[PDB]
Amino acid sequence: VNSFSGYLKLTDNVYIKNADIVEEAKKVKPTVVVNAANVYLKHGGGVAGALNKATNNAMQVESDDYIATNGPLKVGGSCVLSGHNLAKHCLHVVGPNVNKGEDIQLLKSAYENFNQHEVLLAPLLSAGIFGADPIHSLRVCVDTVRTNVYLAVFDKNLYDKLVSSFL
């Protein structure tokens, strides 16, 4: 038993809710919150901008030190950093950005990072400003992630489309 509340169960291991991942993180304090990161960990907008703003820019400060030491992530890759006031840890995961021409097949590789964590609060990778079809993203999530994932979908209209079309 865990503290996530109000989720619809999609599969054995995937759950979904119409929620602001920032508010959800603030209430649950999950072990892991997933950020929709880019390779530079520049948290300017979308989920990343929202999460970073909620940390009062501490996420960005930590991220800049990470990049200065290690260089950029790979598309499809990830790193574990602090969760600041939102979670124990933040798993920064880079899904392909369609608006940069990145190969959508890398979406499966991106979701594979979730399997290194038993339970996660997460957005749909490559959705929103990353330009992928969120229905496709949900399908890849369900077919790739084997650990327990609680998906927060900000847009109510999208949440209902995701639920009603889910196979």
Ligand X SMILES: Cc1cc(S(=O)(=O)Nc2cnc3[nH]ccc3c2)n(C2CCCC2)n1
Positions in the binding site for ligand X (CB under 6 A): 20-22, 46-47, 50, 123, 127-129, 134, 153-155, 158
Pairing of strands 8-9, 14-18: antiparallel
Query: Closest residue (Cβ) to ligand X?
Result: 154
Cβ nearer to ligand X, comparing 74 with 136: 136
Q: How far is the CB of 51 from ligand X (least distance, A)?
A: 8
Do the Cβ atoms of 25 and 121 come closer than 8 Å?
A: yes
Q: How far is the CB of 127 from ligand X (least distance, A)?
A: 4
The sheet that has 148-153: what strands, in order across it?
8-9, 14-18, 148-153, 119-122, 32-36, 89-93, 78-82
Q: How far is the CB of 50 from ligand X (least distance, A)?
A: 4
Helix (H) or strand (E) segment spanning residue 24: helix 21-28
Instruction: Say how far apart CA 148 and CA 30 lie, in whole Å.
Output: 12
Cβ nearer to ligand X, comparing 73 with 152: 152
Cβ nearer to ligand X, comparing 68 with 107: 107
Q: How far is the CB of 112 from ligand X (least distance, A)?
A: 21
